[PDB]
Amino acid sequence: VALDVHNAASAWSKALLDNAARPSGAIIYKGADGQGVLAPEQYERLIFEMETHHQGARNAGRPMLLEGGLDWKPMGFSPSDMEFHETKAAAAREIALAFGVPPMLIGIPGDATYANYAEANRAFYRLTVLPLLTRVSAALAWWLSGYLGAQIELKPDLDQVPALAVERDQLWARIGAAGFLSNSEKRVLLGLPPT
Amino acid sequence: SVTGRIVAMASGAGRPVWGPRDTVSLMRTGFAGNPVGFRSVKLIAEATAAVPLICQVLDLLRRPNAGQGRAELFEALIGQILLSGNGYLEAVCPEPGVPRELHVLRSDRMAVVPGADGWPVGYDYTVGGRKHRFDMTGHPDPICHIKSFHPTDDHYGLSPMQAAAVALDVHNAASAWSKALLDNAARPSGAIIYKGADGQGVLAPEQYERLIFEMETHHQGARNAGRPMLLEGGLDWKPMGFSPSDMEFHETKAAAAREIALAFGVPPMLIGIPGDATYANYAEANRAFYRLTVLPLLTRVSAALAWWLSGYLGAQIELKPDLDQVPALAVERDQLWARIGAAGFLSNSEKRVLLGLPPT
Amino acid sequence: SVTGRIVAMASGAGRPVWGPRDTVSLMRTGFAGNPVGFRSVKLIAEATAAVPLICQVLDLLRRPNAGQGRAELFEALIGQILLSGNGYLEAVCPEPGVPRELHVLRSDRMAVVPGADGWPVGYDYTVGGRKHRFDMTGHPDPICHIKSFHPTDDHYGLSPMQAAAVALDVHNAASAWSKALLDNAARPSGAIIYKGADGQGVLAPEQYERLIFEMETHHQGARNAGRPMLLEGGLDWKPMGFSPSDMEFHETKAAAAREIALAFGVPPMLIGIPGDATYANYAEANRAFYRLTVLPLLTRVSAALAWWLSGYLGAQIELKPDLDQVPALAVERDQLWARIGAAGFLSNSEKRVLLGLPPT
Amino acid sequence: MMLNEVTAVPGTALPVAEFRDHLDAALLSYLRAAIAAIEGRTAKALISRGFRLALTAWRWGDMQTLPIAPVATVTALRLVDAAGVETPVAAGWRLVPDMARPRIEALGAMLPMIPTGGRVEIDFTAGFGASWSALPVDLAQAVFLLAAQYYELRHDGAAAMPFGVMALIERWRTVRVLGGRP
Amino acid sequence: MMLNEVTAVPGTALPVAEFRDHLDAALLSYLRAAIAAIEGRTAKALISRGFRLALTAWRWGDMQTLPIAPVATVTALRLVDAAGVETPVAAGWRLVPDMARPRIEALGAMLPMIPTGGRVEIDFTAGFGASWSALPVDLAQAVFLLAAQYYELRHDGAAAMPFGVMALIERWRTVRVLGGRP
Amino acid sequence: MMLNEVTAVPGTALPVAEFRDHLDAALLSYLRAAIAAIEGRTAKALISRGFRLALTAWRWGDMQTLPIAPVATVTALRLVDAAGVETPVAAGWRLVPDMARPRIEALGAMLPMIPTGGRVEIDFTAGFGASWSALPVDLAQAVFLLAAQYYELRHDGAAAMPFGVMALIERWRTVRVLGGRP
């Protein structure tokens, strides 16, 4: 449903820029009666004094003397911005909520949840990437072990992922500063071979 | 493989399956039509051409042909993957191995032909009404076909432009909304209404020449801003306004221009889209750019170069992006060097190997 | 190469394929018409001319011809690539190698001719009605043709100006909106309505001379701001306003002026466009400028200089931008020198080679 | 753009025998004062008279709609020069019969170009039919509801029925909403 | 788009004997001035007269609704060329009888294409019935409430009952709300 | 969707003897001008005449409400093809008698499908009763309050009682509030 709101609220403004009549105004010609059209000898005159002298950026403010019967009623365009704007963003944030991407990474404009991309990328590779990869590689590990004889395990390697460096450096500073235990006992806490 | 024989016929064997279509109608309105789709491709394609490549054939890549160079080739290759989802590479080879030239054949004048089983039998380069008809019934396979992921099509990729093709049509039109409105709109500063003695009545040419000369000389301009304008019986000055003045589709044009950057993957800081800040200080906006949408894109193009060019020389070759020589990952690199640099428990020869340095 | 024979005829062999067109109608309205398109090209072209070049022929580049110098040549060359997407260079050579002079031939009076196979056979410099007809049926190839990336055309580049050609037409017109409005607009401070005893009636010249003298002397000016203006029977003072006073197309002119800077690649801090801050403190706005849109542009122009000028002397030459001598990358350089400077585990001769210093 | 007519209506084609029944030099002086009042409000012609649209510049390049609405058989497109050598052209355009917009649509090309000084003129025979029995009857009824008013009251004096003069000619007037540049 | 009619109504089919009872050259001159006034407000035909819709471009590719509303038996679709070789086509479309939108729905394909210059024309016999006794009686009553007004008052003079002329023809008018692009 | 009626009312079933008492070729010409004026405002039938609803596409798949409101005994559902082989179907649907929405509710399945070109038509005999004494009397009174107006004033002239023509037919009109998509 959040896809159908974000498709349609974006196709709302696509259509509205393609089929909408705003005028800058309207030159109302009622006439001597209650109604009356103006002649083609007068309609060719009225265009040439509107095209040449009153339209464009270079004619922005001409006085437009109005005779008896003529009238200039300037039309507006009252909802100008923001046709389904905070519902299109609210739908575009509920799409990112379902797949699990945080709104910082794709660039959805919203109140900040994560701070500085060191924790937005770290939450991305921990909530919706590495749980998804540890289920696909675990089904690869069992299915491909039906082809060779020995059962095989095949799981994600967190050590070689740059998004978990903020996880990794506070680990290495935890037991690195723990000087009470020996050097061969802190290599095994990090996954290093003791020498 | 087995589905090869069953999906090929269900598509039409031995006939050209032409492109998705509308790709040209998006290239001239979404790459040459607005700056946001223009700059987003030019930001990515000039970033993938800048990251060096290492060999785990380099004279071919550093000088492909007589025209475009190493950086001009990848600007032309990624500029077809970002525009049409398909990257093509012709290779000519007089020698039996390691071809002399590489040519990025443009993708909108290129179609596949599926054929009998699975992988395609050739490609048709149709310019005008003349086709070339390449052949894939051999080992070296003269056209490399780099694809983006397409979940429903079997033979092409999905351009990030096709995803954002509505957001391009909003950013083109909301910018051409205000282009038109500055070219065909009548605002007056006012109107001098002359009803007359009757309910209506025009004013004579002896009076219309007088009314202009006292409006031109004494009442218009910056130097006449505030003249009293004595109004007789019948005359009247009704000053017109212009009530929506700023911001005709302003926060929808910015919201569309941010959904174009969302599709290609550029963050809105790098191209300069005005929006609530997401990244902080360009040390992490540039680092997220070369990690989410440049280096994943480059590690798929160079990996298809590594397999296709290894069909020309005998030994299988690997050719992948080198993160060490990219200035956007220095904030990644210095917190690595400070992590094991401050880890004084392990020896000096054990921390050179953790950084990719040769032990001495 | 093979597609050479098939794309050339489909375009018209041996006839001039003229420029895209409208390039002049964009140069005089988007480079000499508004400051935002003016300053953005002059910011980039004076930045690419300032970065030194190293040789991996320098007397040719430091003194091309009798007129424009080393920095005046690249301001003239990049100023054609940014305006029209095509950079041209004539070389005259009395000597059989290393030509004497380099001339930036302007691109709007230059057209290609495709010819028989692939790469073009010549170029036509048509000023007035006289053409020159250069020749490319030889090795030294007297015209170098630097192109920007164009996805649909085969023989030209895409000017960032053609992408932002609507944003130039909004910034020209919204600035000429307020130029006109200050030159043809009638605001009055008020109107002294004289209806009279009837429904209408003019006031006599003996009364109109009296009404001006008591309005000029006693009621107009700064020194008369607040006089009571006793109004008799029939007279009336209706004070007119001016309801949209500021900001006629103000946030659309700034939004258009920021989309011009988005196309050329300048950040809005450097030229001074008023907008929500994206970069922080000019140490990263200047560093992103010389990394996203200057050094990618310079490494494509100098790489085409390196291949074309190596067709004149015997040995192949490389000529690429020198990042070491650019003050905008000092924030890149000092965090490099502090990274391996603080890395005390490796020796002194091993950290001189990590910085590009000769070991002693 | 002048559009002066070639030949006036003869008066033998006007229904002065029928107008008398509805209620000869005074009756016929009131129908054509009511025919010309209805044509000027509806931009019609009603008697298929001949015209000459002599204009100085073509508004578009596949257009210049004709103002008198019911057209048939544009006779010529005379393309004069300044001295008046008067060379007519005979190909390039098409009369497109349309009550909405009687226009010259051209033939997939720019319309005939006009010399410096030599104003192009169009002569055409526009109207419903050559007689009075070829009109739409409500537009023929609106003439009689107006000409019987001019007969029965001489100066601008005082007196609205459901289908009056105005309600019958409200569907023949040109409905235009372009006061713009093109 | 012209839509000029092929044959006018004979006048032997008009109820001048019935109009006289409700209240011959002056009576019949007032029914067809009131038939044509009601058809122009309701876009109807009332006497099943023959028409020729000669138009230059098809508005849609499975459409071009016909303006005269009660239709039956589109005779031909003559597809002329510029010189006028006049070759009619006979297949591809369907007349879809509908009082709302009398349209040519085609046959699951684009409608017959028009040559450059050769305007396609449609001749059709649209209306309720060939006689006066085949009409809806309220639309037949609205003619008599209007033609008896034109009889009983000659110039545009002064005088609303519950079911008047306007309340009887308010349900035959075309109710349209598209002033848009398609 | 046309809905032309099969047989008109005979005129022997109209109460011209009763209308005369309330106040024959002129009286009967005013009841059916007032019967057809009330049916067109109330979408009713009043004399149980036969109809043919010939429509081109079913609006829903368990619907297509019939416009003429008091229905009984849908005779057939003829499902024609393009050439007109005229094969009627006899099962699948149900006439659901309802003064609100006379609809074809189907039988727990999609309604009979229409061939390409072959418009499905429904013939049904809708109305209150075959005589005049079977009507609701207020709807019979509203005909006499309108037909006595058409008798007593001939052109659209001037003159509201508590239960008038409009207050008696305000409860037979179709009250609809859907101008939507379905």
Numbering used by the authors:
A (entry chain A): 199 to 393
B (entry chain A), C (entry chain A): 24 to 79, 90 to 393
D (entry chain B), E (entry chain B), F (entry chain B): 1 to 23, 36 to 171, 175 to 197
Question: What is the paper's account of this structure, in its own sentences?
Answer:
Gene transfer agents (GTAs) are DNA-containing phage-like particles produced by some species of bacteria and archaea. The genes encoding proteins that form Rhodobacter capsulatus GTA particles (RcGTA) are derived from phage DNA, which has been integrated into the bacterial genome. Here, we use cryo-electron microscopy (cryo-EM) to determine the structures of RcGTA before and after DNA ejection, and to visualize the interactions of RcGTA with R. capsulatus cells. Particles of RcGTA have heads with a diameter of 38-nm and 49-nm long tails.
The RcGTA head contains a special vertex in which a dodecamer of portal protein subunits (Rcc01684, g3) replaces a pentamer of major capsid proteins. The portal complex is cone-shaped and contains a central channel with a diameter of 28 Å at its narrowest point. According to the convention established for the portal proteins of phages, the portal of RcGTA can be divided into the clip, stem, wing, and crown domains. A dodecamer of adaptor proteins (Rcc01688, g6) is attached to the surface of the portal complex exposed on the outside of the head and the adjacent part of the RcGTA capsid. The adaptor protein can be divided into four domains: the attachment domain composed of β-strands 1–5, the tube domain formed by α-helices 1–4, the adaptor loop, and the C-terminal hook. Residues 175–197 from the C-terminal hook of the adaptor protein interact with helix α8 from the clip domain of the portal complex. In addition, the attachment domain of the adaptor protein binds to the α-helix formed by residues 148–152 from the extended loop of the adjacent capsid protein.
